[PDB]
Structure formats: structure tokens, C-alpha cells
Amino acid sequence: YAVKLKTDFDNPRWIKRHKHMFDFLDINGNGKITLDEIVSKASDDICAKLEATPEQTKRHQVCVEAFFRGCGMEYGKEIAFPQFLDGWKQLATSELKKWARNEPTLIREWGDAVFDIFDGTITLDEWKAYGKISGISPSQEDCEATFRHCDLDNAGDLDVDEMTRQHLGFWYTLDPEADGLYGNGVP
Ligand SMILES: O=C1N2C=C(c3ccc(O)cc3)N=C(Cc3ccccc3)C2=N[C@@]1(Cc1ccc(O)cc1)OO
Ligand SMILES: [Ca+2]
Ligand SMILES: [Co+2]
Ligand SMILES: [Co+2]
Ligand SMILES: [K+]
């Protein structure tokens, strides 16, 4: 499968995918999120529960900051969904230009940081833990779906190169080959 490179930013399914994620981040239901909250979730919550080392936590935070700044987030800046989505259009565009130049993307680099906390492969049990800890996929069945969906290595583990290809399609281009990456956890 060739990763779908053309964007599809007006497709209701792409909007819905990010609306789901925004509302997931908007825990207090007030329609706005900040980079502060995202970084706290990354560092104070996820990395702590994963027992990341201090250096791994810091690297992961740099990647989360860069990723979400790429969608227009900033500390102290309260962003609502329409502006957030507009930021994702910009991030996707930028990321696809990097991909075309064979320059590591911000989604790759975030992946590298996540994978390194799990020791560039992750096992299904590690993915299940991530799903619960990050909250993106707390159903272990949806995590099993991710592994069924992806092309796995010879051990049945997931590699960051494959997850990055999947994430380009899932988060940026609405690639049909990426549908179902998170099972039913994320539409
Ligand atoms: O991709 C991922 N995410 C995308 C969004 C997200 C958020 C908003 C959107 O509109 C769309 C997507 N939110 C979270 C969860 C999270 C959010 C904030 C801080 C830390 C973690 C998240 N975790 C990741 C981490 C990851 C990255 C690359 C890999 O190869 C493997 C794992 O795997 O799912
Ligand atoms: Ca909020
Ligand atoms: Co490799
Ligand atoms: Co194979
Ligand atoms: K598979």
C-alpha cells in the first residue's frame, strides 16, 4: 500500500476524527484546550505512568510541544475546535512537505519518543498500556485491532516506520488504508 498523500480536509470523517480527539482533550467541556494541558498530559500523566526516565520524558515533551505547536497551540493560548482544526490543516501540509523530502516528520519524531519509552518496536501489551494510559484507546480489543490492521514485524510487534505511515494516513490524509488504526477507539 502506497500511503495516500492527497489531503481531504473538508471530508466530514476527517473533521469528525479530530473533533473526537479535541473533545477527548477537552476534559472540562469548556470548548477550549491549551498547550499547557497537552504537555501536562504528556509529561505529568503519561510519562510518569510509563515510568519514563527523565531524559525520555524531556525528549517526549520536546516532541509533543513541537507537534502541537505545529497545529497552532501555544502555552497560555486557549484554542477552540475550529482553530485547532485549521492548525491541523497547516500541520498536515507541513508534514507532507517533509515526507516528500524524506525529512523526518513531527509525527515520526513523536513516535520515536514514545517507542523509546517502551525500549523502534512496541509489543501489543505495550500498545494496550499506552491505550489505557494516554486514554486514546482504553479497550484492549481496539488495541488488538490496531495490530491486526497494521503490517507487523516478524515477532508480531509494531515498528515505528509502519506506525508513522499509518499515522500520516490516519491523522493527515484520511487514507482508507489507515481506517481502523485505533479500532473503534477513534473514528
Ligand atoms: O498519535 C498519537 N496521538 C495523537 C493524538 C491526537 C490528538 C489530537 C488530535 O486532534 C489528533 C490526534 N493524541 C494522542 C494522545 C495524547 C494527546 C496529548 C498528549 C499526549 C498524548 C496520541 N498519542 C499517540 C502518540 C504516538 C505518536 C506516534 C507514534 O508512532 C505512536 C504513538 O498515539 O496515539
Ligand atoms: Ca477545556
Ligand atoms: Co527500524
Ligand atoms: Co511481514
Ligand atoms: K497484522
Domains of the chain listed by start with CATH number: 1-187 (1.10.238.10)
Q: After which residues is the chain broken (C to N over 2.5 A)?
A: 119
Resolution (A): 1.1
State the distance from the centre of ligand 1 to the C-alpha of 5, rounded, in angstroms: 20
Q: 3-class SS at 52? A: coil
In Å, how far from its chain's centre is CA 20?
13
Atom of ligand 1 nearest to the CA of 131: 34
State the distance from the centre of ligand 3 to the C-alpha of 163, rounded, in angstroms: 11
Q: Is residue 132 within 6 Å of ligand 1 at its C-beta?
A: no
Q: Is residue 160 within 6 Å of ligand 1 at its C-beta?
A: yes
Block residue for cell numbers 476524527: 17
d(CA 115, CA 94): 23
State the distance from the centre of ligand 1 to the C-alpha of 101, rounded, in angstroms: 23
Shortest CA distance to 25 belongs to which of 66, 93, 98, 85?
85
Q: Is residue 136 within 6 Å of ligand 1 at its C-beta?
A: yes
**Helices and strands (DSSP H and E) totals, the chain:** 9, 2
- Cα dihedral: 43, 82, 79, 55 (round 10): 20
Enumerate the β-bridge partners of residue 33: 79
Ligand nearest to the Cα of 38, by number: 1
Enumerate the β-bridge partners of residue 159: 121
d(CA 84, CA 88): 6
Q: Is residue 114 within 6 Å of ligand 1 at its C-beta?
A: yes
**Nearby residues of 98 by Cβ (< 8 Å), 6 or more positions away:** 104, 105, 106
Which DSSP category does 135 fall into? S
Q: 3-class SS at 121? A: strand
What phi and psi, each to the nearest 5 degrees, are found at residue 148?
Answer: -60, -40
